[PDB]
mmCIF file of C-alpha atoms in Angstrom:
data_model
loop_
_atom_site.group_PDB
_atom_site.id
_atom_site.type_symbol
_atom_site.label_atom_id
_atom_site.label_comp_id
_atom_site.label_asym_id
_atom_site.label_seq_id
_atom_site.Cartn_x
_atom_site.Cartn_y
_atom_site.Cartn_z
ATOM 1 C CA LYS A 1 0.000 0.000 0.000
ATOM 2 C CA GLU A 2 3.025 2.484 0.321
ATOM 3 C CA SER A 3 3.034 4.190 -3.144
ATOM 4 C CA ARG A 4 6.127 3.650 -5.338
ATOM 5 C CA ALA A 5 6.507 7.391 -5.403
ATOM 6 C CA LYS A 6 6.770 7.381 -1.591
ATOM 7 C CA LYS A 7 8.999 4.302 -1.613
ATOM 8 C CA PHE A 8 11.309 6.056 -4.063
ATOM 9 C CA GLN A 9 11.477 9.055 -1.719
ATOM 10 C CA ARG A 10 12.126 6.795 1.266
ATOM 11 C CA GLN A 11 14.818 4.683 -0.384
ATOM 12 C CA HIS A 12 16.575 7.275 -2.600
ATOM 13 C CA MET A 13 15.957 10.953 -1.534
ATOM 14 C CA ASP A 14 18.126 12.621 1.056
ATOM 15 C CA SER A 15 18.181 16.231 -0.075
ATOM 16 C CA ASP A 16 20.071 17.892 2.750
ATOM 17 C CA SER A 17 23.127 15.687 3.588
ATOM 18 C CA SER A 18 26.737 15.805 2.320
ATOM 19 C CA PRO A 19 28.249 12.528 3.554
ATOM 20 C CA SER A 20 32.052 11.994 3.768
ATOM 21 C CA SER A 21 33.736 8.935 2.160
ATOM 22 C CA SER A 22 34.133 5.940 4.435
ATOM 23 C CA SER A 23 32.033 7.636 7.155
ATOM 24 C CA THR A 24 29.028 6.278 8.945
ATOM 25 C CA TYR A 25 26.251 7.929 6.789
ATOM 26 C CA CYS A 26 25.160 4.742 4.954
ATOM 27 C CA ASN A 27 25.136 2.711 8.106
ATOM 28 C CA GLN A 28 22.721 5.318 9.573
ATOM 29 C CA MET A 29 20.574 5.968 6.476
ATOM 30 C CA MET A 30 20.210 2.308 5.372
ATOM 31 C CA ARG A 31 18.786 1.561 8.853
ATOM 32 C CA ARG A 32 16.689 4.755 9.143
ATOM 33 C CA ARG A 33 15.035 4.214 5.733
ATOM 34 C CA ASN A 34 14.137 0.612 6.668
ATOM 35 C CA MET A 35 16.547 -1.082 4.209
ATOM 36 C CA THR A 36 18.127 -3.325 6.792
ATOM 37 C CA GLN A 37 14.847 -4.840 8.031
ATOM 38 C CA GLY A 38 14.995 -8.614 7.668
ATOM 39 C CA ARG A 39 18.092 -8.416 5.409
ATOM 40 C CA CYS A 40 20.871 -5.922 4.543
ATOM 41 C CA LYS A 41 19.947 -4.403 1.122
ATOM 42 C CA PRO A 42 23.259 -4.916 -0.741
ATOM 43 C CA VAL A 43 23.514 -1.593 -2.635
ATOM 44 C CA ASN A 44 21.492 1.597 -2.702
ATOM 45 C CA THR A 45 21.824 5.196 -3.941
ATOM 46 C CA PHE A 46 20.701 8.337 -2.094
ATOM 47 C CA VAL A 47 20.186 11.584 -4.031
ATOM 48 C CA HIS A 48 21.173 14.890 -2.335
ATOM 49 C CA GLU A 49 19.155 17.333 -4.381
ATOM 50 C CA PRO A 50 15.808 18.981 -3.780
ATOM 51 C CA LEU A 51 13.053 16.437 -4.467
ATOM 52 C CA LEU A 52 11.807 18.811 -7.127
ATOM 53 C CA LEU A 53 14.935 18.456 -9.289
ATOM 54 C CA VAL A 54 14.623 14.692 -9.198
ATOM 55 C CA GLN A 55 10.898 15.026 -10.055
ATOM 56 C CA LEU A 56 11.640 17.208 -13.103
ATOM 57 C CA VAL A 57 13.987 14.464 -14.433
ATOM 58 C CA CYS A 58 10.665 12.901 -15.604
ATOM 59 C CA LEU A 59 10.546 15.578 -18.383
ATOM 60 C CA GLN A 60 14.139 15.378 -19.492
ATOM 61 C CA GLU A 61 15.981 12.879 -21.796
ATOM 62 C CA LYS A 62 13.887 9.711 -22.313
ATOM 63 C CA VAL A 63 16.121 6.593 -22.338
ATOM 64 C CA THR A 64 15.732 2.870 -22.166
ATOM 65 C CA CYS A 65 15.531 1.304 -18.663
ATOM 66 C CA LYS A 66 17.897 -1.503 -17.651
ATOM 67 C CA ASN A 67 14.935 -3.888 -18.073
ATOM 68 C CA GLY A 68 14.150 -2.683 -21.683
ATOM 69 C CA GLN A 69 11.154 -0.669 -20.639
ATOM 70 C CA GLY A 70 10.915 2.741 -22.187
ATOM 71 C CA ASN A 71 9.767 5.064 -19.401
ATOM 72 C CA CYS A 72 13.238 5.911 -18.065
ATOM 73 C CA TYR A 73 14.740 9.376 -17.801
ATOM 74 C CA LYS A 74 18.318 10.670 -17.593
ATOM 75 C CA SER A 75 19.041 13.955 -15.743
ATOM 76 C CA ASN A 76 20.141 16.850 -17.863
ATOM 77 C CA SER A 77 22.687 17.485 -15.094
ATOM 78 C CA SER A 78 24.886 15.660 -12.662
ATOM 79 C CA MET A 79 23.608 15.417 -9.112
ATOM 80 C CA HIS A 80 25.204 14.766 -5.726
ATOM 81 C CA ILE A 81 24.594 11.238 -4.764
ATOM 82 C CA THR A 82 25.969 8.678 -2.365
ATOM 83 C CA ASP A 83 26.352 4.917 -3.115
ATOM 84 C CA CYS A 84 25.973 2.665 -0.077
ATOM 85 C CA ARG A 85 27.584 -0.812 -0.569
ATOM 86 C CA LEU A 86 27.411 -3.611 1.969
ATOM 87 C CA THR A 87 30.877 -4.628 3.270
ATOM 88 C CA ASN A 88 32.124 -8.243 2.884
ATOM 89 C CA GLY A 89 32.218 -8.923 6.633
ATOM 90 C CA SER A 90 28.575 -7.951 7.051
ATOM 91 C CA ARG A 91 26.206 -10.505 8.396
ATOM 92 C CA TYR A 92 22.592 -9.571 9.092
ATOM 93 C CA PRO A 93 21.540 -8.017 11.482
ATOM 94 C CA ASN A 94 24.861 -6.274 11.485
ATOM 95 C CA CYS A 95 24.666 -4.372 8.127
ATOM 96 C CA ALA A 96 27.764 -2.225 7.654
ATOM 97 C CA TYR A 97 28.113 -0.081 4.431
ATOM 98 C CA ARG A 98 30.827 1.776 2.508
ATOM 99 C CA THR A 99 29.702 5.374 1.854
ATOM 100 C CA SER A 100 30.757 6.713 -1.554
ATOM 101 C CA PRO A 101 29.716 10.289 -2.289
ATOM 102 C CA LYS A 102 29.982 11.322 -5.900
ATOM 103 C CA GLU A 103 28.467 13.464 -8.652
ATOM 104 C CA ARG A 104 26.638 11.500 -11.480
ATOM 105 C CA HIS A 105 23.639 11.856 -13.847
ATOM 106 C CA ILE A 106 20.764 9.696 -12.551
ATOM 107 C CA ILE A 107 18.313 7.622 -14.464
ATOM 108 C CA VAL A 108 14.789 7.069 -13.100
ATOM 109 C CA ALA A 109 11.598 5.387 -14.187
ATOM 110 C CA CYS A 110 8.526 7.573 -14.030
ATOM 111 C CA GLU A 111 4.854 6.673 -13.913
ATOM 112 C CA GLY A 112 1.489 7.942 -12.749
ATOM 113 C CA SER A 113 -0.324 11.217 -12.657
ATOM 114 C CA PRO A 114 1.495 13.300 -11.614
ATOM 115 C CA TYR A 115 4.283 11.717 -13.681
ATOM 116 C CA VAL A 116 6.942 11.110 -11.033
ATOM 117 C CA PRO A 117 9.870 8.821 -10.198
ATOM 118 C CA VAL A 118 8.940 5.346 -9.081
ATOM 119 C CA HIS A 119 12.269 3.581 -9.508
ATOM 120 C CA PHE A 120 15.955 4.557 -9.312
ATOM 121 C CA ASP A 121 17.375 2.717 -12.391
ATOM 122 C CA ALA A 122 21.049 3.778 -12.588
ATOM 123 C CA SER A 123 23.561 6.483 -12.321
ATOM 124 C CA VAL A 124 26.040 7.322 -15.071
ATOM 125 C CA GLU A 125 29.280 9.318 -15.303
ATOM 126 C CA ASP A 126 28.616 10.670 -18.858
#
């Protein structure tokens, strides 16, 4: 019953942080956003840009999704993001993550009315 739009916000939007590399940000955020409940989600990307800018990506360059579907969109601009990757030693319920801040274009799937992001598909260096 949680909307995909809301799920996408929960899993992928963190507008106001600027994590440091190999800091504790992913450990915190992966737990806070409920992605270590019952398992440690292996990899996840947070976007540090106003929700609006991510939402407007739905009107930008239309591209193919990783699954061949055609409702994917690539940001006109690079965006601050952070990649959270589970460490090798990690065993649920201890879920420890590497935090990797970077700047990349993002690609999202959009659906619905309003036409908004429902899936974070990829990021690319371009």
